[PDB]
Symmetry: D5
């Protein structure tokens, strides 16, 4: 099942610069795994913005929740989740 | 380049049914052509709603504008256009 | 899996009263079938308003979409859909 | 009487880790008792968010207020409360 | 139980004038009985607006729903409902 | 003349317990005084929230501003003020 | 008592032309009176829009309400009302 | 030319008492000068809130900008600026 | 002085076709004159929309008001106006 | 490709005068270069606010994104990006 997921990142200014670097690296490694495995299907950045606009391909809401909750950035994210359906006019794969 | 495009459809209440069925057919035919040609890259239906969420891959704003203005549904659409950029953490193709 | 679904009903003021009564009877019959078959899991009235707050239990976004699209009231509904996940603190049935 | 209640949780970043862990266990024990007793009728996780959607079954607005005010998380919650009425098309339990 | 209820009225421009007079009289008669009985506890008009801001006192959500749905104006109202609780500092 | 006033409270997290309780005590005392004198005509708690919905009965906007300013909570309140007029269909007290 | 009042005007497209010119003349005459009295204290037009942004100067909310309800345009107006208080830094 | 200006004030919670005092004093002195000179034409308090609604009378957008930027409170203000035009019904 | 002006066009669906043609021709001729004279300094279309986003250069708010009020499309426009100032970092023309 | 870009600036309250002076200087120098090279086509101040309205002229969304990310002010900016198209009624340069 497909979901459109928007994430806005607000890392705190008083965040320790050294922890910030560890967080950033952990986040990148985690999104790599998830893209390689296919759950994180598309990953784009809205032009001019931090954060991402993505499509996830997972088999349940619970799975999507666990993936998002697991992200190192989660405590600093604002997330919007929108289910996507097959469009009858679609030519090719969803 | 990539654009995330949301469209919501509000067809007039007083549309003659013979016109409405042919308008829907022409819209579907036009989106088919655009998907086949590659400009309309992804097309999804907003779950529970008469609209679509799409990704267009076109070479200019003017090209996207002309494509949207061309749609049979255009006079009845509410459209939001968001430019998408490459995410540095992307694994694979944009 | 579960979805929280809000629906608000806006029937046209010019609706033939006989057609309005037929439409309402059709809507009520359709929601009965969907509740008996288990997809329409919970159904409440929004106090003071002509609408409902519901919980649907289906196997895909597409299933939910087809169900909502099929409702006799669909052309007159404003619908919001939100996925729900199992809460780790839940004691009892979902 | 039933109420739909949305809660979003924003724990302070400067929360002492032992304070936080015990706050989390206290919250879970409290929601457990309220669910066992029936006042907290349904509880779901908002997919992708630190929060919940709940249905409470209590005898008065005052009873609901006291329950919410008493939750360990209350000082860190954003709460929305909406009364629910019995829907005439309901087949099955509320 | 108390509820704060806001109502905004939008009567259609194409309402038959006689029908509009009758509707207004029916609405006023209905709010009169509900206020006399106590369920419609307070009724104010928002300054500058064709609406009301009210407090209802009823025994359940279902009772309030039936009362609101019963109003002659219901098809033309935008309604917001908010539960009110006793304030511990109330004197 | 009558005003509907909504207040939401956001106390600082960094208050010593003694200063927090003193603040809450001063607030309660101030609201008691205004209620006894009649300027604070009605006072209700928003179910599930730390705030109030109130009706003030005062002789000028200037008087209302000074009253609201004078509340110990003022520096921590979000306030909305709405003038109320006598309703021609009213039967009973304002 | 001072109030900041915003009004946006939406006349029906199907208004009889004669009736519409009459309504406009009645509105202008009514605002003239209220301005002469000082109750409609300031009257401006938001640049680019059909309506007004105004300050009213009246004794009570109820008086303001009757004034607004009285306007020939009232059925076609969207109105926002905000109370204004004396500012301690005001000079004059 | 006239402008309707809304200002909402959010002073830092960490300001020194003495420093905040001086800052408020500087703000009040600046608004006094601007009102005496006529550029700050009207100044009202938004009832119940720490803000103001103002009308400015200046000769260009650039002049208004320089005036607002100069306010001691500027870093702590949220400002909305609306150009006002002469109303044909103004007496 | 300069103003950013956004305009969205909503022509009635019940316009006689000749009237609509004349209206469009009149609008285009009026915007031509204003651009040639310099009051309408810049004119762009928001991609995907029937409107424009423009910069006007006029000597007063009243002058802008009269120009906008003059437009044949005025009754069908939603307009937003915001003042622009010379930016101290600008290199090149305004 | 033209883009309309709004930026609002929120500099940290704790920057000392020399930090602030240097950051502003760096931002000004960066915008100078971008204007000289033609990517930053128009630049105006938002009257009464610490911000700007700009028109950028670049060959891809990614080019704009890298330019915005490169600004000294970027961590402190709120940015909105809107694609612009050529308007059929335009007389003059874009
Ligand atoms: Cl990200
Ligand atoms: Cl699930
Ligand atoms: Cl579609
Ligand atoms: Cl282009
Ligand atoms: Cl329903
Ligand atoms: Cl929770
Ligand atoms: Cl009413
Ligand atoms: Cl309170
Ligand atoms: Cl007007
Ligand atoms: Cl009054
Ligand atoms: Cl102020
Ligand atoms: Cl246009
Ligand atoms: Cl002017
Ligand atoms: Cl800037
Ligand atoms: Mg007209
Ligand atoms: Mg048309
Ligand atoms: Mg604006």
């Amino acid at each position: 099942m497909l979901y459109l997921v928007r994430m806005t990142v607000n890392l705190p200014r008083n965040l320790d610069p050294r922890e910030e670097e560890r967080l950033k690296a952990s986040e990148k490694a985690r999104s790599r795994t998830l893209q390689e495995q296919g759950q994180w299907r598309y990953l784009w950045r809205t032009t001019g913005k931090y954060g991402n606009i993505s499509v996830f391909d997972v088999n349940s809401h619970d799975e999507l929740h666990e993936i998002l909750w697991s992200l190192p950035f989660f405590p600093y994210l604002t997330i919007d989740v929108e289910p996507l359906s097959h469009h009858p006019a679609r030519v090719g794969k969803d």
